[PDB]
């Protein structure tokens, strides 16, 4: 008789998910192919604070023996992800961020923690952007970035990926911002394609200036990463109709599905750990007091196959098969699905780019 796992699931209040379904979530899967049994304890939150989070986690740990934690909220911050990383590093618990502020990717995690997230990295976003550009025979482009962190690695990855094809790219220039020193920079661009990299509050101004000078219209394709197109239905007054952007699939991927996927991943990792060494690690006694050196779950989830699909991670906390999608801002002024990323090849639905005109 193998043992069973105790998993704690914390979810946001404003997700239209009842607490009964959380503890009856095994019914839809009928335990599926789960190697081990799971006892689920369900807790609901509305908005998290640095002290409320800690109190909740320590109270959960005191009551019973905890083997995992699936966290998903509705607050949109990166401080929540940082706090989850800190708590995991301090208590030796595997934590999965699946939705909300936890799902936001963060680089250079602490090497003694076990925090993993459901999200795509900037390198993968650049990969899909380059794939779409190559698919629409846009072999000439330009790069416009700002001082916002990540631009160095973005540019480096762009160059390295550019230099290696049977296509033959024709990159033009790399303009960086540090009207008396940037007027020059904005006067040296002609290529239709313009890959931008900044925040929204700077993108609005850059795009407005480009429009007012004459960088918008029929043939001027602006592509921006998921950082510039974040919260949907918050479109500013000046975003041209015909933008192309990448975003994580929030239209067909459901919370009920991703919680079940996280449970499957944790169960498979624990089963692999038990098979090798005959014990499953757990959390410590309590938060308040005064290092698990043998083994951790940090090596048994290098590859994990569950229910056919490969749910494995990488060595840095990234997925191998993220569910990225491609969106466009159509005439009715909202983002619309235009293409899907799956396996290693995108699948567009138009196959010849329609003409989107901006600003009437």
């Amino acid at each position, epitope marked *: *008789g193998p*043992p*069973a796992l*105790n998993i704690a699931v914390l979810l946001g209040h404003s997700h239209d998910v009842t607490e009964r379904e959380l503890r009856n979530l095994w019914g839809p899967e009928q335990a599926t192919g789960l190697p081990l049994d799971v006892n689920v*304890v*369900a807790l609901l939150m509305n908005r998290t604070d640095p002290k409320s989070l800690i109190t909740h986690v320590c109270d959960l740990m005191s*009551g*019973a023996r905890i083997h995992g934690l699936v966290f998903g909220d509705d607050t949109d911050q990166e401080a929540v992800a940082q706090m989850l990383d800190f708590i995991s590093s301090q208590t030796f618990i595997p934590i999965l961020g699946i939705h909300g502020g936890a799902s936001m990717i963060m680089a250079d995690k602490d090497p003694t923690s076990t925090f993993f997230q459901f999200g795509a990295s900037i390198q993968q976003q650049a990969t899909v952007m380059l794939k779409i550009m190559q698919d629409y025979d846009w072999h000439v482009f330009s790069l416009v970035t700002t001082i916002f962190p990540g631009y160095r690695d973005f540019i480096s990855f762009i160059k390295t990926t550019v230099d290696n094809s049977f296509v033959g790219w024709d990159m033009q220039n790399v303009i960086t911002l540090d009207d008396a020193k940037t007027q020059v920079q904005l006067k040296k661009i002609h290529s239709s394609v313009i890959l931008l990299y900044c925040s929204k509050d700077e993108a609005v101004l850059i795009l407005s200036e480009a429009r007012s000078l004459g960088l918008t219209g029929y043939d001027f394709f602006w592509i921006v990463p998921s950082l510039v197109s974040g919260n949907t239905e918050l479109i500013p007054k000046e975003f041209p109709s015909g933008l192309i952007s990448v975003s994580y699939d929030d239209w067909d991927y459901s919370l009920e599905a991703r919680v079940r996927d996280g449970l499957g991943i944790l169960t498979t990792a624990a089963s692999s750990m038990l098979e090798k060494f005959s*014990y499953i690690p757990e959390a410590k*006694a309590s938060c308040y007091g005064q290092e698990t050196p043998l083994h951790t779950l940090h090596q048994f989830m290098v590859n994990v196959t569950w229910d056919g699909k490969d749910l494995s991670f990488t060595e840095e906390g990234y997925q191998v098969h993220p569910r990225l999608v491609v969106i466009v801002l159509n005439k009715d002024r909202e983002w619309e699905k235009v293409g899907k990323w799956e396996n290693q090849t995108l699948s567009l639905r138009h196959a010849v780019w329609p003409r989107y005109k901006s600003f009437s």
Partner: antibody
């Protein structure tokens, strides 16, 4: 089936130290925690500490901290309890118990016979 | 910790009707919808035996005459009918806080 067995009775001129064994012959000895309890002459029970043989982690009670040492031997499937500096208050019966890892509570299911130490 | 209390210390009941035992705790033991309370039976000279776990679930392999219910901080256990089984002591144990604590016991005749 899971079975636990302990040593016999003990007796010692005051001032010695005692060691008690508990053997498991029905499961994977390195997966389930083992707990030790004390029972005085018929007025209650207490809790000393627990040991996980697979990883070697140990936790104790502050009342019995520094008095009882819990050790395990993964080869002979024996759990060892080391009481030191016996006094007149250490005449009691002890049990080794192990739960079943299928529930959310922390209960005791399998019990040994128990050994009566006398000072 | 959590300090339990059992009343009455000694109980004397006729054979046939029923027996009732109460065990009230100092603090609440509920843990996200699952109260943590266990009842034990200990014959003289023998290790105890688990009867009820989680304060409402009976244990497989035990007679159906045993049953327990309660929530919050007040808990109870009632057995019916009375037979030659209820000649031992009974205890209550909480597992909400480390370390675990037991009751004081209660005899029957």
């Amino acid at each position: 089936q899971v079975q636990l067995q302990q040593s016999g009775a003990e007796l010692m001129k005051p001032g010695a130290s005692v060691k008690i064994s508990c053997k498991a012959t029905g499961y994977t000895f390195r997966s389930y925690w083992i707990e030790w309890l004390k029972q005085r002459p018929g007025h209650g029970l207490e809790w000393i500490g627990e040991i996980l043989p697979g990883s070697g982690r140990t936790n104790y009670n502050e009342k019995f901290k520094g008095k009882a040492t819990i050790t395990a031997d993964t080869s002979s499937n024996t759990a060892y309890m080391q009481l030191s500096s016996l006094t007149s208050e250490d005449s009691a019966v002890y049990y080794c118990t192990r739960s079943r890892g299928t529930m959310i509570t922390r209960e005791f299911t399998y019990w040994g016979q128990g050994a009566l130490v006398t000072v | 910790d959590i300090v339990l209390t059992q009343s009455p210390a000694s109980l004397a009941v006729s054979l046939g009707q029923r027996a009732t035992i109460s065990c009230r705790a100092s603090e609440s033991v509920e843990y996200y919808g699952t109260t943590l309370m266990q009842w034990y039976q200990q014959k003289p000279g023998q290790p105890p035996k688990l009867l009820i776990y989680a304060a409402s679930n009976v244990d497989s392999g035990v007679p159906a005459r045993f049953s327990g219910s309660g929530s919050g901080t007040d808990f109870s256990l009632n057995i019916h009918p009375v037979e030659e089984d209820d000649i031992a002591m009974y205890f209550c144990q909480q597992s909400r806080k480390v370390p675990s604590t037991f009751g004081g016991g209660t005899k029957l005749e």
